[PDB]
Amino acid sequence: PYTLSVALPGSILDNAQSPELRTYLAGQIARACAIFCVDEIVVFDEEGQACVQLARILQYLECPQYLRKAFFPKHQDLQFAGLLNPLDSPHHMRQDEESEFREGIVVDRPTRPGHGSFVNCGMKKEVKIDKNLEPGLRVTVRLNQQQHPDCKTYHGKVVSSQDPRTKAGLYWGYTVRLASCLSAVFAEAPFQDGYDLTIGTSERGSDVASAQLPNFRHALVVFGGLQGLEAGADADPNLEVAEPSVLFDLYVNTCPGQGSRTIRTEEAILISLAALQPGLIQAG
Amino acid sequence: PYTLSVALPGSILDNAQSPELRTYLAGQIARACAIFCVDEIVVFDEEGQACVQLARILQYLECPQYLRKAFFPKHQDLQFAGLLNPLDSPHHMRQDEESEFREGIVVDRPTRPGHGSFVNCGMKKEVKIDKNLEPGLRVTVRLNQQQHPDCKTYHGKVVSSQDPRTKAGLYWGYTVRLASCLSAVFAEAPFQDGYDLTIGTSERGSDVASAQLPNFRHALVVFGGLQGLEAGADADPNLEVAEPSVLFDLYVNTCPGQGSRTIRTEEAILISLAALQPGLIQAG
Numbered sequence: 001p002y003t004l005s006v007a008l009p010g011s012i013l014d015n016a017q018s019p020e021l022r023t024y025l026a027g028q029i030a031r032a033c034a035i036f037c038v039d040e041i042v043v044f045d046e047e048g049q050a051c052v053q054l055a056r057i058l059q060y061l062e063c064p065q066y067l068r069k070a071f072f073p074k075h076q077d078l079q080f081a082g083l084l085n086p087l088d089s090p091h092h093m094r095q096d097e098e099s100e101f102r103e104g105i106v107v108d109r110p111t112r113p114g115h116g117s118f119v120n121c122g123m124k125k126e127v128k129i130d131k132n133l134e135p136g137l138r139v140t141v142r143l144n145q146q147q148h149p150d151c152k153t154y155h156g157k158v159v160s161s162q163d164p165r166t167k168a169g170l171y172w173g174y175t176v177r178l179a180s181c182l183s184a185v186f187a188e189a190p191f192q193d194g195y196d197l198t199i200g201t202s203e204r205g206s207d208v209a210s211a212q213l214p215n216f217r218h219a220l221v222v223f224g225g226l227q228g229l230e231a232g233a234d235a236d237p238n239l240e241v242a243e244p245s246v247l248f249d250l251y252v253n254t255c256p257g258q259g260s261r262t263i264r265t266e267e268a269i270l271i272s273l274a275a276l277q278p279g280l281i282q283a284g
Numbered sequence: 285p286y287t288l289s290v291a292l293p294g295s296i297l298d299n300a301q302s303p304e305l306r307t308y309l310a311g312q313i314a315r316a317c318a319i320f321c322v323d324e325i326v327v328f329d330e331e332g333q334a335c336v337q338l339a340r341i342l343q344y345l346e347c348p349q350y351l352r353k354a355f356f357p358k359h360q361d362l363q364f365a366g367l368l369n370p371l372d373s374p375h376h377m378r379q380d381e382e383s384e385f386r387e388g389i390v391v392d393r394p395t396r397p398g399h400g401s402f403v404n405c406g407m408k409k410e411v412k413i414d415k416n417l418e419p420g421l422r423v424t425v426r427l428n429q430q431q432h433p434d435c436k437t438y439h440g441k442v443v444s445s446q447d448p449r450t451k452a453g454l455y456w457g458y459t460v461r462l463a464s465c466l467s468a469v470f471a472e473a474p475f476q477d478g479y480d481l482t483i484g485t486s487e488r489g490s491d492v493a494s495a496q497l498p499n500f501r502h503a504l505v506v507f508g509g510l511q512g513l514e515a516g517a518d519a520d521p522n523l524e525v526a527e528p529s530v531l532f533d534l535y536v537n538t539c540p541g542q543g544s545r546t547i548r549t550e551e552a553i554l555i556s557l558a559a560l561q562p563g564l565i566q567a568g
């Protein structure tokens with residue numbers, strides 16, 4: 001049940017030429033991570049509004065559409081939502097789509113103790129659950145197979161959000177984490193033992209074709225911005241290194257003989273994850 | 285000196301949400317082909333203004349900026365040129381950049397016979413060449429090493445446009461070809477013996493990791509549109525097949541276990557070329 005996390009700088013968005021393209025770029029980052037079943041995106045400050053906007057946009061696209069009205073008030077950072085590309089991930093389904101799992105928001109309707117909670121799972125009727133939970137929390141509902149066809153609510157139980165993947169093979173979205181500097185990308189990892197495999201990307205790294213990935217459980221691929229990973233490194237007072245290869249288990253160039261002087265970050269992610277997917281599958 | 289050609293449908297542009305994004309998409313196609321040193325892009329009609337616009341935009345970005353004013357009158361298809369991303373390819377260089385090769389446009393200035401031609405290569409002074417050529421033709425000038433430092437023109441000789449690559453290792457741009465249907469992608473190949481390796485892309489193809497590419501000299505990777513390669517196949521009266529795998533030497537899925545229902549064409553190109561680059565280098 002290995003994980004993959006991706007770190008890019010929020011400053012990527014400042015290089016955009018129009019506010020629309022600023023949004024659209026943010027959407028391209030989300031789709032690339034969704035395509036490769038990324039579990040976590042880490043938006044880090046290379047030098048703070050660029051990272052907030054990027055993270056927010058990432059969270060909006062990750063969130064099942066029927067839940068965005070509840071989790072996202074009207075925000076200026078979402079003023080160009082429409083011109084986006086849907087993630088079309090397995091938890092972004094329509095209402096007339098049978099599914100074993102379904103994301104949900106715990107509603108505010110009265111319930112005597114003992115009587116579980118009501119959850120909006122975007123179905124025709126709400127879902128009554130087992131546990132009594134706070135009303136406004138996002139949960140992962142597993143629906144009862146044999147339901148009670150005339151009941152005014154469906155029934156299911158709140159399960160771990162990692163159940164759809166580690167149990168049914170279904171990609172179920174990423175989480176988004178805001179990092180305040182480059183060293184916080186590593187130090188603030190969501191996992192106890194940290195990232196046991198860390199992969200940095202540069203045109204000065206070694207050839208990906210020669211790289212050998214060790215067995216792992218939590219992998220982090222890290223991408224720089226306009227100025228490369230060198231900028232977040234020099235900016236960070238914690239770091240104090242001369243060359244970024246030393247902060248990573250591996251420092252790879254994933255496009256030998258590129259035909260353009262520069263690969264932009266959103267292009268580098270698709271190329272890098274493609275070029276690493278073989279080794280990532282087999283090592284995990 | 286093997287070649288790689290990429291075929292996509294011009295209809296890709298109709299799916300865009302705003303005229304700006306229509307342009308920007310076209311720019312993403314060019315950058316992806318430039319990054320992987322593609323030699324030829326084939327824009328084919330899946331069903332005709334979408335393919336013309338796409339081809340034109342591709343030719344504009346390929347063309348050294350100092351030559352675009354000459355080769356491109358003011359066109360409505362270029363009304364959003366600015367919001368593009370430069371290719372930044374080795375033949376897109378500044379004026380104070382020494383280079384052995386340099387693209388050029390044969391100028392209109394008088395010349396007695398015997399006296400070669402004048403070529404604008406975007407330098408401080410024009411270039412006098414060996415041959416007497418038509419005035420308005422795009423050529424590839426190789427500059428004389430020892431030039432004559434006080435002469436009012438530089439000197440060089442017109443060489444094959446395939447010299448910068450097959451001689452100095454430099455990527456030197458793609459050409460753009462308009463195809464009228466899917467079978468014209470193959471039949472109208474710029475090479476005598478055709479494409480001896482043809483690779484189709486679909487989520488229904490075999491796993492790229494198992495594919496074995498035969499030795500080759502001219503390779504063509506083909507990408508479908510919104511409706512996949514099935515649409516250009518059914519539309520084309522020449523074809524008359526039930527499943528597209530039979531039109532290609534290889535039919536590959538290049539993203540096992542995608543996390544999104546659909547990979548858009550501009551995303552599929554970066555992922556596919558990355559996933560095939562290893563085998564493409566070694567086989568050619």
Ligand SMILES: Nc1ncnc2c1ncn2[C@@H]1O[C@H](CSCC[C@H](N)C(=O)O)[C@@H](O)[C@H]1O
Nearest residue numbers: 201202203223224225228229253254263268
């Ligand atoms: N060939 C390549 N291999 C792997 N990653 C690359 C790459 N080219 C660009 N990238 C990624 O895309 C990001 C932006 S490209 C910025 C390049 C910068 N001028 C520099 O010299 O560092 C980089 O930080 C890197 O993470």
Ligand SMILES: Nc1ncnc2c1ncn2[C@@H]1O[C@H](CSCC[C@H](N)C(=O)O)[C@@H](O)[C@H]1O
Nearest residue numbers: 485486487507508509512513537538547552
């Ligand atoms: N997993 C994958 N592997 C290789 N190419 C893919 C791919 N997913 C999408 N593509 C490419 O991107 C194009 C647009 S995606 C269109 C998919 C369409 N619904 C269908 O079923 O065919 C496709 O024509 C294909 O060339």
